[PDB]
Design an enzyme around this catalytic site. Structure first.
Site, PDB file in Angstrom:
ATOM      1  N   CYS A   1      29.580  90.747  19.718  1.00 21.95           N
ATOM      2  CA  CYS A   1      29.516  89.437  19.077  1.00 21.95           C
ATOM      3  C   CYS A   1      29.757  89.508  17.569  1.00 21.95           C
ATOM      4  O   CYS A   1      30.346  88.594  16.991  1.00 21.95           O
ATOM      5  CB  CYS A   1      28.130  88.804  19.322  1.00 21.95           C
ATOM      6  SG  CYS A   1      26.731  89.691  18.585  1.00 21.95           S
TER       7      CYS A   1
ATOM      8  N   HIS B   1      22.183  88.078  17.659  1.00 22.65           N
ATOM      9  CA  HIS B   1      23.449  87.585  18.181  1.00 22.65           C
ATOM     10  C   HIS B   1      24.278  86.927  17.084  1.00 22.65           C
ATOM     11  O   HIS B   1      23.833  85.980  16.435  1.00 22.65           O
ATOM     12  CB  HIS B   1      23.190  86.591  19.315  1.00 22.65           C
ATOM     13  CG  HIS B   1      24.429  86.144  20.023  1.00 22.65           C
ATOM     14  ND1 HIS B   1      25.427  87.018  20.400  1.00 22.65           N
ATOM     15  CD2 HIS B   1      24.818  84.920  20.454  1.00 22.65           C
ATOM     16  CE1 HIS B   1      26.375  86.352  21.032  1.00 22.65           C
ATOM     17  NE2 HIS B   1      26.030  85.078  21.079  1.00 22.65           N
TER      18      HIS B   1
ATOM     19  N   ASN C   1      29.977  79.865  20.584  1.00 24.96           N
ATOM     20  CA  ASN C   1      29.507  81.132  21.134  1.00 24.96           C
ATOM     21  C   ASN C   1      30.728  81.868  21.680  1.00 24.96           C
ATOM     22  O   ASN C   1      31.812  81.294  21.752  1.00 24.96           O
ATOM     23  CB  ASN C   1      28.498  80.874  22.256  1.00 24.96           C
ATOM     24  CG  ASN C   1      27.624  82.083  22.549  1.00 24.96           C
ATOM     25  OD1 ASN C   1      27.855  83.178  22.032  1.00 24.96           O
ATOM     26  ND2 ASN C   1      26.610  81.885  23.387  1.00 24.96           N
TER      27      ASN C   1
HETATM   28  C1  LIG Z   1      25.562  90.776  19.436  1.00 26.07           C
HETATM   29  C2  LIG Z   1      25.775  90.623  20.940  1.00 26.07           C
HETATM   30  O1  LIG Z   1      26.907  90.756  21.407  1.00 26.07           O
HETATM   31  N1  LIG Z   1      24.666  90.397  21.687  1.00 26.07           N
HETATM   32  C3  LIG Z   1      24.569  90.672  23.180  1.00 26.07           C
HETATM   33  C4  LIG Z   1      25.618  89.782  23.964  1.00 26.07           C
HETATM   34  O2  LIG Z   1      26.350  88.973  23.395  1.00 26.07           O
HETATM   35  N2  LIG Z   1      25.667  89.968  25.294  1.00 26.07           N
HETATM   36  C5  LIG Z   1      26.586  89.235  26.191  1.00 26.07           C
HETATM   37  C6  LIG Z   1      27.325  90.302  27.017  1.00 26.07           C
HETATM   38  C7  LIG Z   1      25.827  88.218  27.068  1.00 26.07           C
HETATM   39  O3  LIG Z   1      26.344  87.470  27.898  1.00 26.07           O
HETATM   40  O4  LIG Z   1      24.493  88.230  26.825  1.00 26.07           O
HETATM   41  C8  LIG Z   1      23.091  90.338  23.633  1.00 26.07           C
HETATM   42  C9  LIG Z   1      22.053  91.230  22.886  1.00 26.07           C
HETATM   43  C10 LIG Z   1      22.674  88.844  23.370  1.00 26.07           C
HETATM   44  C11 LIG Z   1      21.737  88.223  24.421  1.00 26.07           C
HETATM   45  O5  LIG Z   1      24.276  92.790  19.706  1.00 26.07           O
HETATM   46  C12 LIG Z   1      25.389  92.245  18.986  1.00 26.07           C
HETATM   47  C13 LIG Z   1      25.193  92.412  17.467  1.00 26.07           C
HETATM   48  O6  LIG Z   1      26.002  93.080  16.783  1.00 26.07           O
HETATM   49  O7  LIG Z   1      24.055  91.756  16.986  1.00 26.07           O
HETATM   50  C14 LIG Z   1      23.720  91.814  15.570  1.00 26.07           C
HETATM   51  C15 LIG Z   1      23.990  90.460  14.899  1.00 26.07           C
END
Ligand SMILES: *[C@]1(C(=O)N[C@H](C(=O)N[C@@H](C)C(=O)O)[C@@H](C)CC)O[C@@H]1C(=O)OCC
Length: 251
Positions: free
Chosen positions: A29, A197, A217
């Protein structure tokens, strides 16, 4: 500043502002919020339309941005843009641009026709070459940022930044109740913390007396409100105003 603002309506000639991407089964993200806003700003400040490659950011930045699919640092991503630049690259299997995203789209906390996302995803290789058939070369396709900065945890300054320069990247703490968001202004009331996130803030408004931030998102369009969501504004809710970053494209 106006009571409401939607970058999608304010900059009609920049369609990237309206698009929603899919980070796939990868914690990228931090990279998506960045390349999305950068794509928007390149269009805003040079009105050329370019789908900035999430793949280039995710795979080639390195430690300066964190740990790839394991999470990263938003401000680090905008730094990469100014230091190494970013090539173009569209959606998975789109064959658009130098480096299209290589991680398949999936269902993010919702049911659908695509496979369900699996938290476990490895960071793809940093390949400094473009897909076959694309021109120019990787090096020649780089788009550079000329500044990378952090916006203060100040509602008005954040609104002013967006109003003048376009969408910014932000980050907030995700709790399980956010996962099921569908509409309205999100306010955290329950659920275990899922982690940080990074997202893209492209505007603001007021719904039923509740001030909010308009956010895009990166969990595809069948999650939330067509991929977007609104979250409480003005109280640094879940830290939504605490990690705002942006930057300006070169000339
Ligand atoms: C941002 C992130 O990508 N978070 C995770 C995410 O997006 N997962 C997707 C695959 C989903 O559908 O949940 C997850 C922890 C959020 C619920 O860890 C990164 C990041 O770099 O965060 C620091 C800002």
């Amino acid at each position: 500043l106006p009571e409401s603002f939607d970058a999608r309506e304010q900059w009609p000639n920049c369609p990237t502002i309206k698009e929603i991407r899919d980070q796939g089964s990868c914690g990228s993200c931090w990279a998506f919020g960045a390349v999305e806003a950068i794509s928007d700003r390149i269009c805003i400040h040079s009105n050329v339309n370019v789908e900035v490659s999430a793949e280039d950011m995710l795979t080639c930045c390195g430690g300066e941005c964190g740990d790839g699919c394991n999470g990263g640092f938003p401000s680090g991503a905008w730094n990469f843009w100014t230091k190494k630049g970013l090539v173009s690259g569209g959606l998975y299997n789109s064959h658009v641009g130098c480096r299209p995203y290589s991680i398949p789209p999936c269902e993010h906390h919702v049911n659908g026709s695509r496979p369900p996302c699996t938290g476990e995803g490895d960071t793809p290789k940093c390949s400094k070459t473009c897909e076959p058939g694309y021109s120019p070369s990787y090096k020649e396709d780089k788009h550079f940022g000329c500044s990378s900065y952090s916006v203060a945890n100040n509602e008005k300054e954040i609104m002013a930044e967006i109003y003048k320069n376009g969408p910014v990247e932000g980050a907030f703490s995700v709790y399980s109740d956010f996962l099921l968001y569908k509409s309205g202004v999100y306010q955290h009331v329950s659920g275990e913390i899922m982690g940080g996130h990074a997202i893209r803030i492209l505007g603001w408004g007021v719904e039923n007396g509740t001030p909010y931030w308009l956010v895009g998102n990166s969990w595809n369009t069948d999650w939330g409100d067509n991929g977007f969501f609104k979250i409480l504004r003005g109280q640094d809710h879940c830290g939504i105003e605490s990690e705002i970053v942006a930057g300006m494209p070169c000339t």
